[PDB]
UniProtKB/Swiss-Prot annotation:
The modification N6-acetyllysine is found at residues 35, 38, 185, 257. Belongs to the AAA ATPase family. Necessary for the fragmentation of Golgi stacks during mitosis and for their reassembly after mitosis. Involved in the formation of the transitional endoplasmic reticulum (tER). The transfer of membranes from the endoplasmic reticulum to the Golgi apparatus occurs via 50-70 nm transition vesicles which derive from part-rough, part-smooth transitional elements of the endoplasmic reticulum (tER). Vesicle budding from the tER is an ATP-dependent process. Phosphorylated by tyrosine kinases in response to T-cell antigen receptor activation. Phosphorylated in mitotic cells. Homohexamer. Forms a ring-shaped particle of 12.5 nm diameter, that displays 6-fold radial symmetry. Part of a ternary complex containing STX5A, NSFL1C and VCP. NSFL1C forms a homotrimer that binds to one end of a VCP homohexamer. The complex binds to membranes enriched in phosphatidylethanolamine-containing lipids and promotes Golgi membrane fusion. Binds to a heterodimer of NPLOC4 and UFD1, binding to this heterodimer inhibits Golgi-membrane fusion. Interaction with VCIP135 leads to dissociation of the complex via ATP hydrolysis by VCP. The gene is VCP. ATP 2 binds at residues 54-59. This is Transitional endoplasmic reticulum ATPase. The modification N6-succinyllysine is found at residue 185. The PIM (PUB-interaction motif) motif mediates interaction with the PUB domain of RNF31. It is linked to Inclusion body myopathy with early-onset Paget disease with or without frontotemporal dementia 1: An autosomal dominant disease characterized by disabling muscle weakness clinically resembling to limb girdle muscular dystrophy, osteolytic bone lesions consistent with Paget disease, and premature frontotemporal dementia. Clinical features show incomplete penetrance. Frontotemporal dementia and/or amyotrophic lateral sclerosis 6: A neurodegenerative disorder characterized by frontotemporal dementia and/or amyotrophic lateral sclerosis in affected individuals. There is high intrafamilial variation. Frontotemporal dementia (FTD) is characterized by frontal and temporal lobe atrophy associated with neuronal loss, gliosis, and dementia. Patients exhibit progressive changes in social, behavioral, and/or language function. The modification Phosphoserine is found at residue 219. It comes from Homo sapiens (Human). It is found in: Cytoplasm, Cytosol; Endoplasmic reticulum; Nucleus; Cytoplasm, Stress granule.
Length: 266
């Protein structure tokens, strides 16, 4: 389907740095085209996101399209196999859908025939002007195997690290996932962030979803009972019971690999 996404910056915990870097990569074009002239700026066309799985690369790409009021077209890495015109077909459909954000997901799969579905991606990128109003975003969990051709100026310009949430970020991620549920006042998310170092954003959200299921099942069963003879909440005890089922999804060794990769781009 081709739509404008619902998710906004408000749904993304942490990443305040990356967020305002994305806006000026996006708001510069439009809120000052009367200095977008005066120096001859050839605007952005592509970013490559990287980092551990489940920290919000997809969220950020959707939320870029929500801020621009833009269409969102998402192709997942492996399904480009049968077969080069598939790459042409996708860019034409994202031209047709302008303004549009075209999101290449899971293309660490591609980085391993497949030789030139990369080449059929790169040339398609060079033969599409800034003026077609199509913004490209890519995401990988394997920054070690990025062919730097796709970062040559003209393609995926900016390379943005998306890290595991530190302690502050994890309070933001819990707070955001919960921004519209009724949660009891005995619930301490700052202490829950303290107890979840190394948890991904996905990891965090799962705890929330389990605490929500159990508050739901308890509400079902109780007023099943209270019919034999007032909005319910998610209490602290729904959260205690959600954590039996909770541990980090990303390994400490892998953490190190990302930390080293990013910290050597300063
Ligand atoms: N910064 C964040 N704030 C809130 N939720 C997050 C965040 N990062 C990840 N999540 C949760 O984890 C899920 C998966 O995130 P996603 O953006 O698909 O990760 P990635 O693209 O890095 O693999 C999201 O639907 C969201 O609920
Ligand atoms: C299928 N496996 C998966 C893990 N893996 C790897 O290399 N991970 C990695 C993590 C972080 C980083 F920065 C680089 C690599 C080997 C192949
Ligand atoms: Na990922």
């Amino acid at each position: 389907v081709v739509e404008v996404p619902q998710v906004t910056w408000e749904d993304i915990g942490g990443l305040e740095d990356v967020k305002r870097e994305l806006q000026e990569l996006v708001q510069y074009p439009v809120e000052h085209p009367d200095k977008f002239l005066k120096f001859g700026m050839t605007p952005s066309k592509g970013v490559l996101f990287y980092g551990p799985p489940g920290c919000g690369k997809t969220l950020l790409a959707k939320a870029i399209a929500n801020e621009c009021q833009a269409n969102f077209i998402s192709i997942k890495g492996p399904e480009l196999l049968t077969s080069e015109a598939n790459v042409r077909e996708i860019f034409d459909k994202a031209r047709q859908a302008a303004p549009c954000v075209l999101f290449f997901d899971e293309l660490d799969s591609i980085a391993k025939a497949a030789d030139r579905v990369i080449n059929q991606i790169l040339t398609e990128m060079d033969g599409m002007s800034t003026k077609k109003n199509v913004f490209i975003i890519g995401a990988t969990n394997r920054p070690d195997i990025i062919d730097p051709a796709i970062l040559r100026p003209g393609r995926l310009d900016q390379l943005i690290y998306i890290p595991l949430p530190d302690e502050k970020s994890r309070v933001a991620i819990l707070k955001a996932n919960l921004r519209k549920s009724p949660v009891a006042k005995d619930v301490d998310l700052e202490f829950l962030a303290k107890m979840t170092n190394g948890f991904s954003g996905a990891d965090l959200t799962e705890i929330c979803q389990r605490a929500c299921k159990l508050a739901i099942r308890e509400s079902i069963e109780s007023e099943i009972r209270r019919e034999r003879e007032p909005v319910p909440e998610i209490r602290r005890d729904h959260f205690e019971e959600a954590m039996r089922f909770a541990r980090r999804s990303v390994s400490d060794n892998d953490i190190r690999k990302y930390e080293m990769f990013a910290q050597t781009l300063q």
